[PDB]
């Protein structure tokens, strides 16, 4: 079929981010509003209800490299979180442990990644994990 080139796909995601989607429990935008490369993004996830993540806002950094969206983006939590697939010391998201990233398709997007991480927060193996104090962030 017809592939939309990286920069134009990212402009589409930019506009969708600004319009917002669904109930607004995930959101994304450019980290630097003068970054013409559209590389570094800020992600936000509202922790889901009836989990240990509830009523907490999670900030993330999402990096869309030169081969995005053929290649998956790199993701890390800024806000500290105890969650399977997330390195507990650095916040880095292990792609092999998150199915959307391990089985990446070029139809996916920053939105899809954030929605998946939020869905996974509701999983039996995550929803009961004791969390660090609210507000803490990793370094680097």
Partner 1 sequence: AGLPRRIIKETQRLLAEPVPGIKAEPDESNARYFHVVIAGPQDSPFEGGTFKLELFLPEEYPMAAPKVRFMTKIYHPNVDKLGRICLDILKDKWSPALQIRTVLLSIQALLSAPNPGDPNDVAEQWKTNEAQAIETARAWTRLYAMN
Minimum CB separation from partner 1 for residue 49, in Å?
A: 36
Would you state the torsion angle of the CA atoms of residues 102, 108, 114, 116, taken in this order, to the nearest 10 degrees? -60
Minimum CB separation from partner 1 for residue 16, in Å?
A: 15
- Residues forming contacts to partner 1 in the complex (CB under 8 A) are 2-5, 7-8, 11, 14, 30, 33-36, 38
Cβ–Cβ < 8 Å for 57, 26: no
Judged by beta carbon, residue 3 or residue 103, the one nearer partner 1 is 3
Q: Strand locations in the chain, DSSP E?
A: 26-30, 40-46, 57-63, 74-77
Minimum CB separation from partner 1 for residue 42, in Å?
A: 15
Cβ–Cβ < 8 Å for 67, 61: no
Judged by beta carbon, residue 45 or residue 110, the one nearer partner 1 is 110
Judged by beta carbon, residue 23 or residue 33, the one nearer partner 1 is 33
């Amino acid at each position: 079929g017809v592939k939309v080139p990286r920069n134009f796909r990212l402009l589409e995601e930019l506009e969708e981010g600004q319009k917002g989607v669904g109930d607004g429990t995930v959101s994304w935008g450019l980290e630097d509003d003068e970054d013409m490369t559209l590389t570094r993004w800020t992600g936000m996830i509202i922790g889901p209800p009836r989990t240990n993540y509830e009523n907490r806002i999670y900030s993330l950094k999402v990096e869309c490299g030169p081969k995005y969206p053929e290649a998956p983006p790199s993701v890390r939590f800024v806000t500290k979180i105890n969650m399977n697939g997330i390195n507990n010391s650095s916040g880095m998201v292990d792609a092999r442990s998150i199915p959307v990233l391990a089985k990446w398709q070029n139809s996916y997007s920053i939105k899809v990644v954030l929605q998946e991480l939020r869905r996974l927060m509701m999983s039996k193996e995550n929803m009961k994990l004791p969390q660090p104090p609210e507000g803490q962030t990793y370094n680097n």
